[PDB]
Design a binder for this molecule. Structure first.
Ligand SMILES: Cc1cc2nc3c(=O)[nH]c(=O)nc-3n(C[C@H](O)[C@H](O)[C@H](O)COP(=O)(O)OP(=O)(O)OC[C@H]3O[C@@H](n4cnc5c(N)ncnc54)[C@H](O)[C@@H]3O)c2cc1C
Ligand SMILES: Cc1cc2nc3c(=O)[nH]c(=O)nc-3n(C[C@H](O)[C@H](O)[C@H](O)COP(=O)(O)OP(=O)(O)OC[C@H]3O[C@@H](n4cnc5c(N)ncnc54)[C@H](O)[C@@H]3O)c2cc1C
Ligand SMILES: Cc1cc2nc3c(=O)[nH]c(=O)nc-3n(C[C@H](O)[C@H](O)[C@H](O)COP(=O)(O)OP(=O)(O)OC[C@H]3O[C@@H](n4cnc5c(N)ncnc54)[C@H](O)[C@@H]3O)c2cc1C
Ligand SMILES: Cc1cc2nc3c(=O)[nH]c(=O)nc-3n(C[C@H](O)[C@H](O)[C@H](O)COP(=O)(O)OP(=O)(O)OC[C@H]3O[C@@H](n4cnc5c(N)ncnc54)[C@H](O)[C@@H]3O)c2cc1C
Lengths: 387, 387, 387, 387
């Protein structure tokens, strides 16, 4: 019934709550956590109490039953403070996503119910050292032996890997190398305390240092037949489904980071003065902030559209990819320009802009790299012109 | 409620009409009109009687009483067929805008009222050989002489110049050089058949060759005091506001040209075959096609935002300039990439793309060049950090 | 032995000759030939006598013996005035290259010599309506029936195609659809007079409108066994080698057009004033002219190096393709920025810049489009890493 | 006379020496020094004995008395191994550039002589917390007290400051602010152990972390008369001269980093397989690599040109600025793309590319930011038309 760019009073309150938290509780300690690299437990507990965590969990499982548009709205406020921290919080939504859209009443009740009861964490296990962008190439095995599957393999770059209470695991169940991807993998929910799960050490990355990233080995892990999501073989579609519903929020985190660098650079441009004039008075630096503004705004509407698409019951693969490709890219651009506007100071650890550049980079790599995001769009676009 | 990216049933119906028209009536003749540079009188008459023109004219004066959002929607379809014809049609909305926003009852009934009676044209006269972006630097003057104003000066690049029934004229009334912009100009309605007016020849340009662009000389043009819009000195304000309402629409025209270039490039990539596979099979071209869809999609959302903003009673200055700046630029990008994908044929005059590349260019020039758009966004952005 | 960026006295002379011809004779008439499209016969003749045309022909064949470097510094000076004229004149060298790098004395003074006696033109008939970038996709058949070769096929986009005394024709002789490039095409030298040949009409293009571009059908044309170049299955090596000699030159013409673009804009920026000051005194404009100067500077050095390789006796395919890709692109970027700097005037036909924008486009298509250049560089690059 | 793109045999030697050293001694340890931020003394001392360190010191002072071109050649190689080490090594040559181009032989033998005897380091003190780019805005005072000057001020971001034996210091003598830049500053040479000098704590930056970077306070530091550079008041053109002479070697550094990023990414691309192909076989990846190559090759030529010009006895301002702006820009474009190509591994500390991304940023800042370089290029450009 007409276009609208106005939030509901409910969404307005969520954003307020998320914003207050990011500024008063996240920003002050963001650097601390980035230097040390320690899991931000206090901030995660707090976000959990304010209800800015596990917003997709259904109401009948003690959750808020919020949609994607809502999750994006909160995520961007959270990223503004620190994407290293928000990635941890978001790891939960991603790891629990495949259950929200495909698990049954009993699975949802058990694995989603515990998340609402106490600040538990969960992860998403799909990537492997040999296959990331190419999901169809993951080799972690899952042998149907009796009333349990025996999982065997090595997963890599898992967010919340060594902090998860349980995992969503994508494994190959069909041993025939000619088996279609849409019938060869199975989704399992495996409790982290199962004997045979060897959690590796914390990986030292360039940015998002406080986020927990690890590799895991699954040496003859036994999973009950009840933890299979839809059935043997349905794993691929559940994975690709979770991604579609999550890309808008990953696009939202990047916009938050971009917005942070824009605010930082602008505030400095108003304080610094060279060649007798304020930085903001040099036509070049004003064009820079101008273009930086255009980018954050455009990227924002990108995910707002993509999020709306999913919430309206429409297929959003196309829009969500535009959002992820665009937002991820401009986040990186704005981060670099932010440190540039800050001169020697921006390259220094005493300033916040330097860290954003480091954090920005993964927005072009995880969640489907910029290259696969363009493949998707080109695919959803061209198909419109065929028959 | 919250966000919505859905048209109303009446908007979908406008879109359908404009689409059918551009598809069946404009596209077929677009090439001939660009070649001959002949004013598309027939197409303008059809659009007029289809109700796809003079959409802002209030219903109390015979118009439809539509808003900017609706104008944008119709305009993107018209531009898809030909931006030359669309520009001709948009000149009217630009000429009538100062009257719709600042005219009194008697002025609207008289000057708008007849646009409803016949397919008449009008123009927006403010640019000059010495001034375009710097509106405050125009030198055409108006001397109060009894019950008349005697205008003296020359305007340049007036779209629908020697085709208008009447004009909107911005002229300087305060002779004092150091007088402020907000009180030195006056906006008049000048009937075409007034004696001192001398229309120039058709200006031959590179793009939108069938639109009537030309300069005009006013040598002791007497204008009734009745014809001043708000009053002596209120001219600058009326012009700056007219630009705000019309910018999202000129941006909408840039998206139309862009979508045309995309359709053409895509249709050809699904048919031309190089190195044993369709162009769409070569990842480079697929990536090319991807970013093209990406750009146009984000551009469309930017003009929709700027249009919604104003209809809701907001100062849309910030969103309108982002729209016009972005859309103006992506239109040129898509246009050049479209001919590129068509190779040697793309450069040939018998193919629809070269004309798109030529038309696109003014989108960064008129209605506020790409530079002054960034100038505005910077201005609008910095204020929010000053206090 | 030691880097040197200086020309030899002889070269410095050639440059000043081509320059005066360009700026005193070509420039005052470039506009007219663009508007009419008619072949600049006079300009081509005047250039012949000055020695600017057919520079590569050997001293023994009456020619001057100029190397590639010299051809480049001459082409750039000509193209500065008009890429249209420069292209027709350049069609000669291109059509001669195959006979120069792979012909025998007899063939040499038969074909090059005449070219020394009269201002005759030649063409390089390689591309076809169905195959442009994919040389191996060439379908023009050539069968050896006794002491001769009967040839049937069609060409498309041949410069000097209907003004050529003799042509260079590449055609497949090995019917076997799996005949390697290597051993599947034969290069000939077929004079325009041989019955069976038929020049199509003149193609109207968006730019370099005075240049002669037409298609040629070869409907049962016989070529004497002697007018074959190096033999059977020799044709492919020849064309690639020719290309390889000319890419630097097309890159030179492109750099020529860009210099003209940067000159016009800079001069306009030093006269036009907006908001009190000259255009140049606005940072966004100075920064524009600066990057326009950078782009051109780098492009010039790129072609000079590509030219040096071939002359130094070294292969140049890597630097060649780096040179044409960069040069062809920047030429387009400069041309459009120049139009922008001139504002409304730049978009008008009474101003020089507009033509440059229409001309520049082919510098990204003919002589190996921007995509295959990227493909050639990539392969030349990757190659030196594996083993 | 004649263009030449080939080093002399001597230069080839230097290249090989700097190459073997960087790739066999710097590379294997650059990772450690990066993490630890420890001054690479072993590496610096070794460079010193290899004869790659004070390459500009005139023979009569024990030095090799090499020119800029040779310095660029050597620097690009040291940088390939690591720009943190290279910077410390480069800090000396920058710091002794004024003495070289302004010192009287008595000062020369004393200061440039030490360097020839022991690995002595030096620094270039010009930037201060209040100004870096706006050089003429420095506030460190120099006060004449007979045959000596008393300095008071504070510098910031000094390379090798805290490790330098002596400092080249630019301070403002004339207190009359209405005094021109060309007669307001005086350059000095000061023993690093003079009372009043308070070296600050090492700064923790994002890039070239083993490179030493500190601030310094001059609290009543006494400087003898004979330690002034051309005369009192000539210090502004002396600093500006050194800049023009060093800029190309800063560009060479960037290019070194770009080659590293290029090789590092091409090698990975030749082994990493996704979707059953090597990354190199995915057209979008090879196109990426082709453009990475293009940028490096051009950036190399720009610094060679700039370096030649200076060694040719002519002003290189225009080309030096074209070189530093371009090289610094693309070095970052390659650094980021190198990370992209290695994907998840690229963002991880276990791989080389990440460090390159953190190092590359400074090249757009120090040695004159990307903004000021363009001001210079534009300045030199419009000037060629001004007359
Ligand atoms: C910090 C971090 C956290 C992560 N967290 C998670 C997590 O919680 N859960 C999870 O399951 N995964 C996670 N990942 C993995 C992440 O999603 C993958 O890194 C990403 O999908 C890229 O995969 P890769 O590194 O294997 O890239 P590769 O596939 O090796 O690709 C390398 C390069 O080649 C390009 N390329 C590959 N295929 C093509 C093609 N067809 N066409 C063109 N270019 C191509 C890629 O775009 C990239 O540029 C995380 C990664 C990181 C670094
Ligand atoms: C086909 C066509 C139709 C038009 N129709 C109309 C119409 O109906 N009515 C009407 O009134 N006008 C019309 N115009 C005129 C158009 O509005 C002006 O050309 C435009 O707004 C300003 O361009 P100019 O020629 O005045 O350029 P200039 O103001 O001279 O500017 C030239 C260049 O310098 C840049 N520049 C200028 N000032 C600055 C600055 N402060 N900082 C940085 N960069 C700057 C500009 O962006 C541009 O790139 C039309 C023009 C064309 C070509
Ligand atoms: C005025 C003019 C004069 C010319 N004069 C001559 C002449 O004298 N002699 C002559 O032989 N030719 C000449 N040509 C032809 C010109 O060289 C070809 O147009 C050009 O080589 C491209 O071929 P195409 O036009 O068939 O385009 P196509 O090969 O159809 O390609 C179309 C698009 O697909 C892209 N593409 C193709 N293959 C790939 C791939 N594998 N990966 C990615 N992208 C790809 C191309 O880059 C282009 O963007 C001329 C052309 C013009 C317009
Ligand atoms: C690691 C490191 C090492 C260094 N080593 C040395 C050394 O040995 N010796 C030394 O003396 N200095 C050194 N410096 C300092 C260096 O020269 C300055 O950082 C640099 O010139 C930038 O000055 P600034 O940082 O004060 O930035 P500012 O002058 O504050 O400028 C900040 C930003 O605004 C932009 N800007 C400013 N004015 C304009 C304008 N007019 N137009 C457009 N954009 C503008 C700048 O380009 C930059 O993007 C070093 C710095 C670093 C970080």
């Amino acid at each position: 019934l007409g276009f609208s760019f106005e939030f509901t009073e409910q969404q307005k309150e969520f954003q307020a709550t998320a914003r207050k938290f990011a500024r008063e509780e996240i920003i002050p300690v963001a650097a601390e956590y980035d230097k040390t690299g320690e899991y931000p437990v206090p901030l995660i507990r707090r976000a959990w109490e304010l209800g800015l965590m596990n917003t997709h969990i259904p109401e009948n499982c003690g959750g808020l039953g919020l949609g994607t548009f809502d999750a994006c709205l909160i995520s961007e406020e959270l990223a503004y403070g620190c994407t290293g921290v928000q990635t941890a919080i978001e790891g939960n939504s991603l790891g629990q996503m495949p259950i929200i859209i495909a698990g049954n009443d009993q699975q949802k009740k058990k694995y989603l119910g515990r998340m609402t009861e106490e600040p538990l964490m969960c992860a998403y296990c799909v990537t492997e050292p040999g296959a990331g962008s190419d999901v169809a190439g993951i080799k972690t095995k899952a042998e149907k032996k009796g009333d349990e599957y025996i999982i065997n393999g090595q997963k890599m770059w898992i967010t919340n890997g060594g902090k998860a209470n349980w995992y969503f695991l994508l494994a190959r169940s069909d041993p025939d190398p000619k088996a279609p991807a849409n019938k060869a993998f199975t989704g399992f929910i495996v409790e982290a305390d199962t004997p045979g799960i060897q959690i590796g050490r914390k990986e030292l990355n360039m940015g998002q240092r406080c986020s927990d990233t690890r590799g895991i080995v699954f040496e003859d892990v036994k999973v009950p037949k009840e933890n299979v999501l839809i059935g043997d073989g349905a794993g691929f579609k559940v994975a690709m489904g979770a991604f579609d519903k999550e890309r808008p929020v990953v696009a939202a985190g990047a916009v938050g980071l971009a917005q942070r660098a824009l605010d930082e650079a602008t505030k400095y441009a108003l304080e610094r003065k060279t060649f007798g004039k304020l930085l903001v008075e040099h036509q070049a630096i004003s064009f820079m902030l101008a273009e930086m503004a255009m980018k954050v705004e455009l990227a924002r509407m990108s995910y707002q559209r993509a999020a709306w698409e999913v919430d309206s019951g429409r297929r959003n693969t196309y829009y969500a990819s535009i959002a992820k490709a665009f937002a991820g890219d401009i986040a990186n651009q704005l981060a670099t320009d932010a440190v540039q506007i800050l001169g020697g100071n921006g390259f220094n650890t005493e300033y916040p802009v330097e860290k954003l550049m480091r954090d920005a980079k993964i927005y072009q790599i995880y969640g489907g790299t910029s290259q696969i995001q363009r493949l998707i769009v080109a695919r959803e676009h061209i198909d419109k012109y065929k028959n």
